[PDB]
Design a protein around this ligand. Structure first.
Ligand code: HEM
Ligand SMILES: Oc1ccc(Cl)cc1Cl
Length: 137
């Protein structure tokens, strides 16, 4: 279920984080504009860049913390507020977050694996509502 999925992802965080983030940029290539140092770089060039692995791992570490603190895939308002008030997220809208979660669920459905992809879709929908409520356009 969702709790096991958090354990699965955490066990190999850097690989899942890189694979899901690339799946996101591949599905929505205009989103790469927010990551100016990743434009025009192949996947293997990205993996040679320290900050690509560091910043993907830390994004997914936080995502897993927010997922773990949720009740029945409903995140804490405090965690939504953290994501809205981050300087790095100042120009984002809830649509950016929805795209990441559409890509994450598509990755889980395409994987070998028994992810609870309905729960990740729900968690994403609930996190979008919490982000709006915390003031994200
Ligand atoms: C639940 C979803 C997300 C979480 C948990 C999250 C978390 C984070 C974290 C922890 C950082 C700082 C990483 C570090 O300094 O090492 C970060 C930076 C950033 N995030 Fe997010 N983020 C999320 C979604 C998004 C989305 C949807 C976008 C844009 C489409 C975005 C754009 C960025 C950008 C541009 C940075 C700074 C890039 C950099 O300096 O490397 N994030 N995010
Ligand atoms: O390194 C990252 C991976 C995913 C997302 Cl959404 C943002 C950042 Cl900075």
């Amino acid at each position: 279920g969702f709790k096991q999925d958090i354990a699965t992802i955490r066990g190999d965080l850097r690989t899942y984080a890189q694979d899901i983030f690339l799946a996101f940029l591949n599905k929505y290539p205009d989103e790469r504009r927010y990551f100016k140092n990743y434009v025009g770089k192949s996947d293997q060039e990205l993996k040679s860049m320290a900050k690509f692995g560091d910043h993907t791992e830390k994004v997914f570490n936080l995502m897993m913390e927010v997922a773990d603190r949720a009740t029945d895939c409903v995140p804490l308002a405090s965690d939504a507020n953290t994501l809205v008030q981050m300087k790095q997220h100042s120009s984002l809208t809830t649509g950016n977050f929805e795209k990441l979660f559409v890509a994450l669920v598509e990755y889980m459905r395409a994987s070998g694996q028994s992810f609870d992809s309905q729960s990740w879709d729900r968690f994403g929908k609930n996190l979008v509502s919490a982000l709006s409520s915390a003031g994200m356009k």
